[PDB]
Symmetry: C3
Subunit: 444 residues, 3 copies
């Protein structure tokens, strides 16, 4: 609840603390059915515009069904099989003879129903749309006569309204080769999603968590097209199960740390690597290197462990002692002293080099801080913007406390002559070993 931050002047890095986890560790698959009409062409002597409008909407229904049939013949390998493997196993079961008859029997009287498939998966099925009932009762008497009977204009509008969701679902499944994410309101309405969450074999706090973050749940869910067979359209919705909840999470921010000599070509740089989200998980730390894999709402991070690395908990000691022997703190080295800034959760890191004009301003007071050459930091308390060169960044105005941990920039502990300056994935001990090797080649 209380967000705090710590800037480390020695390593030009900051850690944003106080975040709570929700890591996806499991999947809950659910079958969504649409009752279809196995209509055949019913051309009759037709002229008045209402029959034409009905026949037009009926052809749009007919093309949607044939499009789903060619879509289910070809199932592309191009999805990420490791993240849809559950639902794909259910679709392979659905292709069995008699399984669609089973779901067809369970949704015979109600819209929602639990169905035990023939593979040990107790899935929750839904009937979200009933087009066979509408077409066979309200439309077929209209095109199964000698001359077509005249339907009312209310029927034309209601049929375009009901048929619309089938057409949009066929559009999403067609452009995405049967696998869509996020899951749209066409695939599952917010009302249907909340009812599906409420009916899940999870704790009540987990139902409240997923119900209060339905948009994040949609962004971390998949919709997989199964089969169109025997007047039934079935597709699987894969919802995330957050097996890791309320564990401490923190975000590491890094920026280049160079020396600030006045003669160009004589400066060396180092930047901590592995910036991103860290969360405590089962005696280890789950690290998320890609920036788009974790959604934050309030102080809660919602990550997928599929794109994480598992690190020893000693990885946090790079934040307290980068020179600590329990974990080899990783860095990259260079000579690229271009000024830059990183907007953190509660402030801004500024790496100012060369002649760059770096400053921090308040909207009404003007410049309140001028950065000197090196790596520095400013909290969001009293600061609105940070300007670096010709770029203006805005500071996050979120409430919290920042702590400036003063310390000597560690780049000053290195003799420039023997520094390894172009290391793209090194470590503190890796650099020290390359330096020990250059001192033995130079002593003789």
């Amino acid at each position: 609840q209380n967000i705090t931050e710590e800037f480390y002047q020695s390593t030009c890095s900051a850690v944003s603390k106080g975040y709570l986890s929700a890591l996806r560790t499991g999947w809950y698959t659910s079958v969504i059915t649409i009752e279809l009409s196995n209509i055949k062409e019913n051309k009759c002597n037709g002229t008045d515009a209402k029959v034409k409008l009905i026949k037009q909407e009926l052809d749009k229904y007919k093309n949607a069904v044939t499009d789903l049939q060619l879509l289910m013949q070809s199932t592309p390998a191009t999805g990420s099989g490791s993240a849809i493997a559950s639902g794909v196993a259910v679709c392979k079961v659905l292709h069995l003879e008699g399984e669609v008859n089973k779901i067809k029997s369970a949704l015979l009287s109600t819209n929602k129903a639990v169905v035990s498939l023939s593979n040990g998966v107790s899935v929750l099925t839904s009937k979200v749309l009933d087009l066979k009932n509408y077409i066979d009762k309200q439309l077929l008497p209209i095109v199964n006569k000698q001359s077509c009977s005249i339907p009312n204009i209310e029927t034309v509008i209601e049929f375009q309204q009901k048929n619309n969701r089938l057409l949009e679902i066929t559009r999403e499944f067609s452009v995405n080769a049967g696998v869509t994410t996020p899951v749209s309101t066409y695939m599952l309405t917010n009302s249907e999603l909340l009812s599906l969450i409420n009916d899940m074999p999870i704790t009540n706090d987990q139902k409240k968590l997923m119900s209060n973050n339905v948009q994040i749940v949609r962004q971390q869910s998949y919709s997989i097209m199964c089969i169109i067979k025997e007047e039934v359209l079935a597709y699987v919705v894969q919802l995330p199960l957050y097996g890791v909840i309320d564990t401490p999470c923190w975000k590491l921010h890094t920026s280049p740390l160079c020396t600030t000599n006045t003669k160009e070509g004589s400066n060396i740089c180092l930047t901590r690597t592995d910036r991103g989200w860290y969360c405590d998980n089962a005696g280890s730390v789950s690290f998320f290197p890609q920036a788009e894999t974790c959604k934050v709402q309030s102080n809660r991070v919602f990550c997928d462990t599929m794109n994480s690395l598992t690190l020893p908990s000693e990885v946090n000691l790079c934040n307290v002692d980068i020179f600590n022997p329990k974990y080899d703190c990783k860095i990259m080295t260079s000579k690229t002293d271009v000024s830059s800034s990183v907007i953190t959760s509660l402030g801004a890191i500024v790496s100012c080099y060369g002649k760059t004009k770096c400053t921090a301003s308040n909207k009404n007071r003007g410049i309140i801080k001028t950065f000197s050459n090196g790596c520095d930091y400013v909290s969001n308390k009293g600061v609105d913007t940070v300007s670096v060169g010709n770029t203006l960044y805005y500071v996050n105005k979120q409430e919290g406390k920042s702590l400036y941990v003063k310390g000597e920039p560690i780049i000053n502990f290195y003799d420039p002559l023997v520094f390894p300056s172009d290391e793209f994935d090194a470590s503190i001990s890796q650099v020290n070993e390359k330096i020990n090797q250059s001192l033995a080649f130079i002593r003789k």
Copy 2:
């Protein structure tokens, strides 16, 4: 048809074989026309709601036309000119005086027609929508009187249905600066695409191939907005021509290969580079380094040669002898021993290091394999999942045969003291030359 796999224990890499190619090497451009109405405002004494609804839909038609006019004045350079250059050459021809009169004459009696343009391109043109006929015959008598005549509600609904495709096409062309990909059903319906494929100057197996993979064809096609001029809206659809068909294709998978000493800081790593899709092509190999450039359907890969590299066929010998003098097998080196796994076509590579808990399970039996430190592999036969640290991966359940090629991990052939450990783009011979240089600097 038969998918096979080979895991190389010596290099921590796997090759998935048996795939057939379809590489895009050409473009087939086609002109899609929409007959428009050069209507002018026709405000008359109007009150009843049906005239207002018609006038509202007519203004939505009017804004769509002016939006396309400002869209064709500004053609952004931001597209990738090298992949739309064909259609852009056709749009430059269409801007000539009299060329729209030519297509206007060919689609005078039929919907589809071949047109020889004034630049030597024999394009296939289509009339997919006729709004000038509908507006000038059914709507203008309704707003060209002293007082507007009253149109029936069927006319209001039919006009919103016909005008809809124009409005959606204007939306896609507006948000994408005139160049859209993939090509939506609004740009070209599946029925129109299949008819366009069938009418193409290609072999019958190529028409069957593109017709059975229409969604992949859409994802590898472009729609370019040409011109709105003289009651004609024209835009080019660029369809892929697969000049390379049924050549062997294979997918290389790589994972870090480190030594497993018990003292941290004493281990060295190496990873094969250039993982991805390889296809035999014209006496050479077409390599696709980016992961999203090749769509797989069944055992067929559909790539665009635009994002390929051409390599000598000897590049396959990195799979049989990484130490082979005909091709310099490329690697990258490091000391980053973080555990990870790679899901292949028929199994999983696991690089287990440190204290990470790596295992392979069956859904009902539990843990059936525990990986030791190093790089190892498991087939999908009897394995459902692979757990590495806090992450659970699912194995692809596709049928095929895997071959575990046992061999000494080549990282064990290197003396750690003189190994080059931070090489970001090296080669087997590059590393040996850096080692020969470190042994001459150490012998003295």
Copy 3:
């Protein structure tokens, strides 16, 4: 207006000149309101289809309002706070008691109106849709009786037309966690955008610039959901302010430059780094490293300075003398001699190595140029395509003048034995210092 190009044979790089800048340096926020109906359920004895259709569309209105309410309770941190910080500051003001009453008073008589908020921001507000007027006057008398009165079918269609924009706006704000970019025509119609631009506190040439590039303006704008409160739906549109206009801009193109010895393993390579867009800006140069951050229309580049680096103007001297002491020209080194090509603004760079078949053709004449081993270039005058290996590239047919600046490839000035060949981010002086160090270790 006149686009020119310069190919540097010595460094295998080209510079496309003559482009004019438009850099985003500020934001103009604007409030978009939708007058809503605080209706409550009004179930009455209803049977005929017109009441059902109205009640159905009313439930779609009701769900859209509750979806926006749960959307405004949860505001995700996941947006990029530094680029939405303006609008977020306005939304925080809008959440104050009485501020929605202020905008509700200013849009009491007109659609557009300037409103001075209680935070010093003089925002331009708009009333783009009026659903409270339509529902309370045309719909409530239809469900506030003993038995529902019968509405005409025109009312059903007009209500689905008016309610549609609310439903689409709720869809975009829901899938994107309240922050959408680009800004759709649903968020702001082209007519409303042009009227908002015209009413902006900017010069007349800036109104003409943004009005002639509305699609680029949309792609560089943000729509942020604020609050739904007291029969008012408010959201902020953030439009770009281009503080840098008509400054010279140029695009740097680079390609690998290797030696062409006949014995593999004896060749060294070097590639200039920092390819992309450069624009003169306030006595410095704004560099844009990512490829998708700058949209080009004609000869004008539209960039966001948010994703730029500020460089000394001496960075242009890498184009005139890469060996020039005022700026340390950056390079990367390797031994990866794979053939490739780069399509420039007026031609094509070709790096041909090994046995690769590189050629340049005219559509009707055939092969007009065969590249030898090394880095070379061809203008678009007389050339249509460039083939490298199995890949065919199309040359941009834009009019301009190219200049081939002959010069010795600088890779030939380096002794291969002491060259640093795996540098991932080096510089000309960095390489010379590593060479000076290898010559001192070899002289003894």
